Symmetry: D2
Subunit: 251 residues, 4 copies
């Protein structure tokens, strides 16, 4: 019987690439999304056309609130409801925007969205994943290769991603006895933002030593599939940079 | 006249030591506290008896919530209302207890542990910076053991990791204003009052330098250095004060 | 036609498993060795029996000395002599023993520990680069415990740190030629051959993931990944393969 | 009576500032140098004119060789010969130049860059510890804040400074039971090379978040003085960046 994976924010871009590559490898998938309903359903349609009854969608806001634990518990539940098991969790969903320290959304909302999606939701999903559990169980957290050389005015986002590194490490430690491995993949510049202009995209491209280009979504996904695979059976607590050398380059 | 500092969680233990040492250096201080009202007020008395009009208290819960931004703004304000300036911020207040992955609801655990260790420091940093030769700086109390965390302390460790990110991000962003941002990372210091000596001693034996915990004063020494004129080029730095504990393999 | 790889210290244990998996994946291999001539020869014989003339041996001392650059150049030359190309370099050979601060001379200890773990990797990297659809890469066998080192292993640990520096510096510098440079960092793998099981168990008990040492094959799996087409954007990265060992506090 | 310190490469620049501040603090000092004899002697004259019999010079090449252990032992011995004790060792001397991967031989590059930056510090540390067989004994290694974002084509120099981090950690661990603390100070840009032109200096200056300028030698020295002081008695294995935020800056 085929294993199953939850991928958060899987409707587009890197999350979709991850869900697609897991599915190609044999997995049944829960494609979680927040606002991108059409794209999520369109992906599940494609995957199910390849293998019937192997993809479902699951909608949730991963902003921090007092109900976030329930929402995270329900995402995991949806995987057991559809597929009878949950082998893999990939924490990919993420809010990303500037939050300058010195002077739209209130700061309360900024905290809730940036820390919720990048850190607290991954924590709650990890709790729920673990509580529901031979086989090959693991979690992969999408981290950021540039956490120690952050973008200017992205403190909350950066705090969130640092917290995600602590979760990766703390959860690797605590869940090791249950056979659940916990690891990360840390992109540098991969698929650039949709709203970014081509000139600014090129400025970022020229900073990458290996090939002067951004990582493809498939390149990020490749690292994810390695860590979930049997070829990574002794690996836990590890974060693999997939950044083409970007984090090595001084100002 | 004399510079002013806010120290969060300053009524006892390390925060008290820090407040006292800053006061001894010539600072006026805002003693923030949450539940330890008697100790805070008694500390303010002692400091004011030493030098008049150099200490006040400010109570606040630093648990994350929709009112935390206001609370943090008011802590910073209390320094300007009392002293007319705010030169140093020390983010010391911290919740610490296990939150296993398998009485408090989990959402309360999140709020307390991520609030006190990370979000409150961010919000105080915002308010500090907005309200601004001078020697302005922030010192965050981090943890030397963040990469080898205590078992079942996920949320606490996430909080201290986020604090490292804030230290770096704020160092970068506030550098144009001359505000330095740094950390001090204890290993074992003091030990919990509720811990029995037998368990205390197991920890002491782990420390290479002396087989003892740090005194609060030793932690405070590092904070004093970072706020001083002898650290004017230092920002984004985290100084371990751990007697080598983080270097010791399992 | 088939790509080719140099694996240093490939006659036994982890380096042997690396060479075997590389060969299994389709590479022709240079099995470098120092003392273990029978095992190296026997391995090349095994691999050549599988596929004709897909393995050769190359002996060299990788201790630092005035002849080390020439020896390293000749290792790379041996790959081109045998196979007409050199796609992959795996710096695996390593001396490992204590060098307390307080019957080899210290200058010999320096030469062996720093030479095998760092200088030879550098010299091999130079020679590999100078000699250059294409998937060119280097993988350095680092150490997950480099920041929590064994007591009295300062020169070894210095070597392994220098090897991290080389991994990063070379990733940057060689990126414009399409040569990727990465590492794999074991925690405990295999354990020493003569170590009593009761001592082995003390180490095993420390590993969170399964309370056991890694197999040689599990380390090799990571190397295969880094050399593969699935890692073609990965450079300057060091993958721990340690079962969580480096996360465990004292 | 007055404690004594050895500062390597102390005739000029940062090592000179260190020696001076140690002396202003009450230490007697061994001014080690290699080629800068006139400067070393001039500094010893200035210090002794301030307080007679409190400075000596000591010449040694710290290039790696089979006699490097003897040279390092003699440096420490010279402090004991002059002053009867050796309380502080500051490993400051350092060769620095490019060694690309693709007039000096490579064996000479290796010996100089790895010798000065790493092996000599190890040997000096050994000899310091062994001679210790009322006091605040410690070692301070001059590291580099940019070791993880290294200058292009500086691999041997970078390998040296990384080994120096490992030494700092390994020796802190091993020497702790003897009451000897071992720490580091990690500049980013300080002073700038004497060779460097005004335009190129300003280019580097502009990179620094805190003040858009290089650190003074005295600013580096301040941190060294802190680490040797009674205010750092629980600090060992710590490396303090003194870089004005430079290492936080992405490409
Ligand atoms: N792109 C890069 O260069 C890069 C660089 C460094 C790190 N990373 C990391 O790699 C991962 C993927 O990057 P990406 O660029 O593909 O991400 P992205 O497009 O920015 O975000 C992925 C998804 O996050 C979901 N999301 C955002 N806010 C949410 C909320 N409040 N609740 C629930 N879901 C929410 C969105 O779902 P809907 O669209 O369904 O609303 C979105 O599709 C992220 O974890 C990211 O931080 C990426
Ligand atoms: N002790 C150690 O060994 C050690 C080790 C590593 C890092 N550190 C760090 O060093 C710092 C000081 O350590 P410590 O042992 O002195 O701390 P602590 O005694 O655990 O706590 C310091 C203070 O934090 C305040 N606090 C807790 N929850 C709060 C809330 N919800 N809102 C506002 N304030 C709250 C408390 O104030 P009230 O008492 O007034 O309620 C408490 O006195 C902390 O940041 C800690 O994480 C300490
Ligand atoms: N095993 C572990 O738990 C562990 C942990 C952390 C890191 N690592 C790293 O993983 C790698 C492989 O580990 P391992 O345990 O398999 O290593 P090992 O058995 O200790 O050594 C590997 C080989 O290194 C070669 N070697 C030693 N001195 C040499 C010299 N002077 N010149 C040339 N070659 C020399 C030897 O070749 P001959 O036999 O032919 O003389 C030896 O078979 C090493 O880089 C190691 O540091 C291993
Ligand atoms: N300057 C910076 O921006 C910067 C940045 C990062 C790190 N650092 C570190 O801080 C320390 C001091 O920096 P710096 O710019 O002041 O250093 P420097 O001027 O480049 O070199 C310091 C001294 O090293 C000695 N030295 C060089 N080769 C030697 C050899 N073979 N044997 C013995 N001694 C030798 C020289 O002594 P003689 O003059 O007597 O020949 C020289 O005065 C160094 O460790 C450096 O790596 C500096
Ligand atoms: C140039 C450029 C633009 C964006 C990123 C980026 C980093 N982390 C992110 N997390 C989310 N969720 N989405 C993103 O787009 C990014 C990195 C470099
Ligand atoms: C044995 C032992 C006990 C406690 C600590 C400790 C770490 N971080 C902390 N943060 C707060 N706020 N309070 C604490 O007490 C601690 C570490 C080791
Ligand atoms: C108990 C125990 C024994 C050895 C190791 C070990 C670490 N690094 C090593 N490098 C080489 N070359 N050979 C080794 O054997 C080791 C780790 C733990
Ligand atoms: C622009 C610029 C120039 C030099 C440095 C520098 C780094 N590490 C060094 N070590 C020694 N010994 N001497 C140096 O001068 C430097 C850094 C930035």
């Amino acid at each position: 019987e085929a294993p199953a994976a939850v991928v958060t924010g899987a409707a587009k871009r890197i999350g979709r690439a991850i869900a697609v590559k897991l599915h190609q490898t044999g997995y049944r998938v829960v494609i979680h999304y927040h606002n991108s309903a059409e794209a999520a359903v369109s992906l599940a349609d494609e995957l199910n056309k390849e293998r019937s009854n192997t993809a479902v969608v699951c909608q949730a806001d991963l902003t921090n609130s007092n109900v976030l634990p329930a929402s995270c518990e329900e995402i995991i539940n949806s995987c057991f409801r559809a597929f009878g098991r949950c082998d893999v969790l990939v924490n990919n969903a993420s809010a990303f925007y500037p939050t300058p320290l010195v002077q739209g959304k209130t700061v309360e909302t900024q905290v809730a969205e940036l820390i919720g999606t990048n850190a607290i939701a991954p924590f709650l999903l990890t709790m729920s994943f673990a509580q529901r559990q031979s086989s090959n169980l693991s979690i992969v957290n999408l981290c950021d290769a540039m956490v120690d050389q952050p973008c200017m005015a992205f403190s909350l986002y950066n705090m969130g991603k640092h917290a995600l590194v602590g979760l990766t490490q703390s959860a690797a430690l605590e869940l090791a006895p249950y056979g659940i491995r916990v690891n990360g993949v840390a992109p540098g510049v991969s698929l650039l933002p949709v709203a970014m202009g081509e000139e600014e995209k090129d400025k970022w491209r020229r900073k990458v030593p290996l090939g002067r280009r951004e990582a493809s979504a498939e390149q990020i996904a490749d690292a994810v599939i390695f860590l979930v695979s049997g070829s990574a059976q002794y690996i836990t607590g590890s974060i693999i940079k997939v950044d083409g050398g970007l984090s090595l380059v001084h100002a």
